[PDB]
Amino acid sequence: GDVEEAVVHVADTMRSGPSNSASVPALTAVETGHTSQVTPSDTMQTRHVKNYHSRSESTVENFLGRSACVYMEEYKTTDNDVNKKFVAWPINTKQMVQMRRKLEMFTYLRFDMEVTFVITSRQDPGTTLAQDMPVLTHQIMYVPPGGPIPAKVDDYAWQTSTNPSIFWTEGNAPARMSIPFISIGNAYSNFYDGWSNFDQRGSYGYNTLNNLGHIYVRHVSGSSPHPITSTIRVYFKPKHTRAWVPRPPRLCQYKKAFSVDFTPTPITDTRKDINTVT
Amino acid sequence: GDVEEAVVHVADTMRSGPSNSASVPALTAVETGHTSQVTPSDTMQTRHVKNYHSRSESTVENFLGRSACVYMEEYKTTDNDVNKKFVAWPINTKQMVQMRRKLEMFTYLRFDMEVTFVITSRQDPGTTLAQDMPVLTHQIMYVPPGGPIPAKVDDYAWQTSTNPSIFWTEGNAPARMSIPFISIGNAYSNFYDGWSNFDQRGSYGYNTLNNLGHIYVRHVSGSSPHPITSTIRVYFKPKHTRAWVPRPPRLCQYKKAFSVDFTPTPITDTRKDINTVT
Amino acid sequence: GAQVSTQKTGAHEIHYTNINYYKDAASNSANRQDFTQDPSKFTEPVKDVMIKSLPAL
Amino acid sequence: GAQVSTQKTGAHEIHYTNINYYKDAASNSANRQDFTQDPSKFTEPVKDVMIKSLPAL
Amino acid sequence: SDRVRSITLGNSTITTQECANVVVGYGRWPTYLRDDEATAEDQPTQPDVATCRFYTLDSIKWEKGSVGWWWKFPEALSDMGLFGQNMQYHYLGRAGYTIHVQCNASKFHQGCLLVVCVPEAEMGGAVVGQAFSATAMANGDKAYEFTSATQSDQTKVQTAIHNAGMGVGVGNLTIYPHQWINLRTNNSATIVMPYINSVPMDNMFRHYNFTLMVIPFVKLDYADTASTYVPITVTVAPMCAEYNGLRLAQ
Amino acid sequence: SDRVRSITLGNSTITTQECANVVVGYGRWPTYLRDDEATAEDQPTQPDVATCRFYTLDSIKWEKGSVGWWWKFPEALSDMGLFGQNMQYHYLGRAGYTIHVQCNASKFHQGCLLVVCVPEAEMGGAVVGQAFSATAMANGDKAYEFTSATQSDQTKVQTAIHNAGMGVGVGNLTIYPHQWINLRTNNSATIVMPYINSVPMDNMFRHYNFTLMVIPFVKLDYADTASTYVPITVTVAPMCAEYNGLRLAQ
Amino acid sequence: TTDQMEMFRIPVTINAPLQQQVFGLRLQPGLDSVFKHTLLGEILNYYAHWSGSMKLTFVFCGSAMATGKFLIAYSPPGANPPKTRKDAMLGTHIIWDIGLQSSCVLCVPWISQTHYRLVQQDEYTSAGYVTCWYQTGMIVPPGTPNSSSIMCFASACNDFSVRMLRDTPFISQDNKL
Ligand SMILES: CN1CCN(Cc2ccc(NCc3ccccc3F)cc2)CC1
Numbered sequence A, B: 001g002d003v004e005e006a007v008v009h010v011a012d013t014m015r016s017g018p019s020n021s022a023s024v025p026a027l028t029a030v031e032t033g034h035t036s037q038v039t040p041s042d043t044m045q046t047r048h049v050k051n052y053h054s055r056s057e058s059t060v061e062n063f064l065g066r067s068a069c070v071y072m073e074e075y076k077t078t079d080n081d082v083n084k085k086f087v088a089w090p091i092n093t094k095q096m097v098q099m100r101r102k103l104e105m106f107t108y109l110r111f112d113m114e115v116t117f118v119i120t121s122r123q124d125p126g127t128t129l130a131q132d133m134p135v136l137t138h139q140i141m142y143v144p145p146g147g148p149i150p151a152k153v154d155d156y157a158w159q160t161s162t163n164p165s166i167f168w169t170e171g172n173a174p175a176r177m178s179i180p181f182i183s184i185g186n187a188y189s190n191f192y193d194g195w196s197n198f199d200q201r202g203s204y205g206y207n208t209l210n211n212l213g214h215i216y217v218r219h220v221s222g223s224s225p226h227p228i229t230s231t232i233r234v235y236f237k238p239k240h241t242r243a244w245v246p247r248p249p250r251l252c253q254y255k256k257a258f259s260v261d262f263t264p265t266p267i268t269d270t271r272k273d274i275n276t277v278t
Numbered sequence C, D: 001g002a003q004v005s006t007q008k009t010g011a012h013e014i015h016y017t018n019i020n021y022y023k024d025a026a027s028n029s030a031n032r033q034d035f036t037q038d039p040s041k042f043t044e045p046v047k048d049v050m051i052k053s054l055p056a057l
Numbered sequence E, F: 001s002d003r004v005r006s007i008t009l010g011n012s013t014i015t016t017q018e019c020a021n022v023v024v025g026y027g028r029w030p031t032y033l034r035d036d037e038a039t040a041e042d043q044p045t046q047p048d049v050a051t052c053r054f055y056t057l058d059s060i061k062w063e064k065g066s067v068g069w070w071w072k073f074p075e076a077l078s079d080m081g082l083f084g085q086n087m088q089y090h091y092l093g094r095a096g097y098t099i100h101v102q103c104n105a106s107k108f109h110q111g112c113l114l115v116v117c118v119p120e121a122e123m124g125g126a127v128v129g130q131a132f133s134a135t136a137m138a139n140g141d142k143a144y145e146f147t148s149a150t151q152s153d154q155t156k157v158q159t160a161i162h163n164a165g166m167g168v169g170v171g172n173l174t175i176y177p178h179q180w181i182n183l184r185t186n187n188s189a190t191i192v193m194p195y196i197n198s199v200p201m202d203n204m205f206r207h208y209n210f211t212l213m214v215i216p217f218v219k220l221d222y223a224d225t226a227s228t229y230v231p232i233t234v235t236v237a238p239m240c241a242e243y244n245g246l247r248l249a250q
Numbered sequence G: 001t002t003d004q005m006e007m008f009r010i011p012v013t014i015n016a017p018l019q020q021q022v023f024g025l026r027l028q029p030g031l032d033s034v035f036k037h038t039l040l041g042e043i044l045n046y047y048a049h050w051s052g053s054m055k056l057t058f059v060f061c062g063s064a065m066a067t068g069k070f071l072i073a074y075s076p077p078g079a080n081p082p083k084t085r086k087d088a089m090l091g092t093h094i095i096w097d098i099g100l101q102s103s104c105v106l107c108v109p110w111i112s113q114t115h116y117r118l119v120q121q122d123e124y125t126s127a128g129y130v131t132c133w134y135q136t137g138m139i140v141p142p143g144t145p146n147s148s149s150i151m152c153f154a155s156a157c158n159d160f161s162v163r164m165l166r167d168t169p170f171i172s173q174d175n176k177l
């Protein structure tokens, strides 16, 4: 009641001696699509070995359980262009190459999410920099699809009544939050070989299923006599992950954020000849 | 269940009286390589004494269980030279003399590690220093061997997806982390009397077994109108230590970070004559 | 309502406590202590079982 | 899952509790409470045992 | 008497009528690798008797001006009987050793030698920041000479005797397994060195497991005799040797 | 199927998908020497795995005009791996052998080979009353050629194929352990030869335990194909080998 | 290779010198160009250490009437790679006979001084070489092609493992997409 209490090493080698029989483990047929299950004990004499190695670090949970940057943008506290004083990003995981490739090794995924925000500020260069400004504060707002979108830093939409938001002050620890599995389907889909219209027309590819919403950021009320620039980095960390239908890793460099377009690439590098080993 | 519960003083002297017999504990023979086990009770009359002294502070765990600096370097927030705005250090324990000598008293070691980072900043001198800059932030990245290495402060490699990293803000406590035993062998080796190539050629010495990786540091996004210099100090603290095959302490001053080279040194200091005692 | 379970160590030569503070299961920490696996799905997708010793065909 | 053990004091003239919060044994604190030792390995490496009272040879 | 010892390995025997006790490494006797500690999968080869036998490694001359000598193993036995051949044909090796040093003189000679096995005896070059080849520190069974004065040639190791070529005090070498040959009461020293390394097995052509060192701590002296030098002989016998990973011969 | 065989010795394996049964000497499997039958007193050495493994002894070319070939053992393996070294360093030796001969051709080729192991295959010189050296009958792993016509050179053995160089009818060699390679239904022949001699052990450099002979009894024939010859390979694996009386290397 | 698909086929000819090497390669699954981009190499490049045995499977894609034998040998680390069949046959090897069963498996045993090896392999942690040689030669009847091809498959055994996750170097970007 006060307390309730709650490891699989790799397979061990086994002693094998000389053999002479009709059994032929070495010979098989790959045409069946079946990968041979032979072991070194079946083709050579071997000693008894106890293996304590474990595959703990190869689990999908651990493989994907690392925070990775997915988007970075800059906004100023004061400027002439209204659009340049706040950020508006449609959520998607295809912006950064490394995590994109990591995720694209599986066709369908289902996981919880942990989001962390890193914010830094710097004073813009100029002819006069002498000023005193108290600590700045920032607001992060999440707008599910179809909700109102602010058009300026001081718009009424920033008074969130249902939209979740975070207020953060510089000098403290980075902000963090958790997000459950929020897909209409039974699992996220990295790829979608299909169209939008039933007549096989319109948008094509994974761009059709991206309806996760938007994220907005602004300086709460800071407006310095001189410009100050801030940068925000977003990090995603899957939790409680499940994956299905593995795929081959991508060979060609990415070129578009919402398409699979690519350029043909050689299979691999070359060497002098088939016998060169040096 | 709610709670589960879980000292060796030095040997005591024993009363000894006058003796006259054929036994001769005082006489021995060092040629056997055996150190005599005689005690003062075996050569002089002694009283009974109870010793409460303990050798707790001489254990290897406590002897090596102190954090020591191993590397310090400086990088600037802004400068013309790209290579001067970030640090790239190959991990090794031979850089600082004191901890090097402490570790070199044993041939093989096996321990967990605790790493602490101390970061400080200062404004570079100049003709104009009036500026206002928010708090700075720093990123520490660890790259196992063979991984991609950034070539500039704003390189893509800084978007770690698998490489662990720490983001730290000035004014808070120093960053800390733990590292398990990460050697391919069964124990770390301070010395290696051997070569790299099987033909007894190439690299020689402990430089061959140093493949621990690299560490990189940068200012996240700070770029001041005027230069700012930062310094980072790295501290190592072994935990759960085991040691084998003690060696004599080094007598000659160190001269290379990856070699045992030295200059001959006198055994010890001199005195007027063999009888001088003043 | 505290869970006690073993932690990762070594073969030849160890308990930690965990408590949940939030009402949403999505807030828990990663459950990276599972090590079950079965490769027969991708390595032996055939219908008829084949004995390694016997000839393939 | 709390461990209770004695702390260092004096001969003539005392409990602390410890709990582990992380799943990795490398995160624990130093186990500097062990005081076992045996110098015979380096002081008596001979094959035949020699009695101190008896002559060496 | 306890001053008489006999050792029998393979088809060879060693008898000494004037000797001290036998030092056994760190109290550990040589033994074969266990099943739960090995890493290689294939069956090893244990050429017992063929390889586990004594091998006289040449002989030196002890003069009044001698300073010391050293040998490196297992390279010293690189071309000695079937041991050398098996070393050449296998990728991995593992074996303990029994070292016996002989040095006899009359009851009118005086001198003292230190016999010590230094595991991982890494050495520094004569000139700091200058590399040496694998010929200034090991060239088969031949013995290398320590020097009284500081070495000057950049092509060889620093031979300063007082620093033992490892930048440490020569007097502190007692820590390692060792024995003393005092001409007053001893003629031979015996040390049984078990296999010490950070890995279960290792290539025996790339790594020097340990170095033997013989240093006269009291210079030889005598008067009015026809004997001008005291020869010194070393004999070594691998024990519980097993090889692995057969391949073309190096 | 019974036409599939697999043999595993040491770190080498042989697989054949088209073969006949395996012939076992005189029904006796190779084995180690027993205690009540030995004569030498010292401990033997059994370098199992290091020496008990397959060794491809070069390859010949089968033409329309080929007559036959022979090899002598253990001299044929005199310089093959650790087997040769151990042979060189020991006075006495004893080991059985497993001989596998490979020869493959299409279903449009025709021919028949006789594979036979002749123990004590003593041979007579080309000229009666004229001695030959130990180079006209064995020079390592190289194969020697039989001749259709009567030999005339006095420096070599009588190579008349019909008499098998032993002054006996070639057709009667069936008495010895043997197998046939018929291209219609076979590609390999396997023979397990136990140790046969009048003494428990013998010097392996002075005595030829047995001779292998491959004789085409039906000449190779084919028509309209780009393949001009059928290569033939021999592979031999010592079994239960043990040596004795170590000494300097021959 | 003007045709990329040609990289997957190992040529073979009817009339070859009695002994002739078919191919040779270094056993560096995570670093060698041959294994760099395979399904196994890609996984390894996300890690730093690896251990265990490996499987190499060869399939003969010639005519049904063709026949031959091949010797495939694995040479542990050494000062020199093998140059002739006599040198190669001393190490671990298997004799492959081509018949109804069109595939043969060479299991590379895990022979190493350390429990683990670096993916970014160096001289210290070498792994050896793998080579293939003609055992008997390829013979064909009339009315068949004079050339054939072989293919190789790579995979890990059941005792394989990896550790120390790292970021792969094969993928990079210069600007935000
Ligand atoms: C294309 N991939 C599909 C999987 N999807 C996972 C995912 C789901 C939700 C979130 N939410 C991030 C968030 C946190 C806090 C406030 C607003 C937010 F949008 C992130 C990733 C990623 C895209």
Ligand SMILES: CN1CCN(Cc2ccc(NCc3ccccc3F)cc2)CC1
Pocket: B091, B092, B093, B094, B113, B115, B142, B177, B179, B182, B188, B189, B190, B212, B213, B214, B215, B236
């Ligand atoms: C030559 N000595 C050998 C022992 N080795 C111990 C050791 C092992 C690992 C680390 N890691 C430090 C670290 C922490 C966090 C991120 C990256 C890191 F590299 C330190 C010491 C020291 C060298």
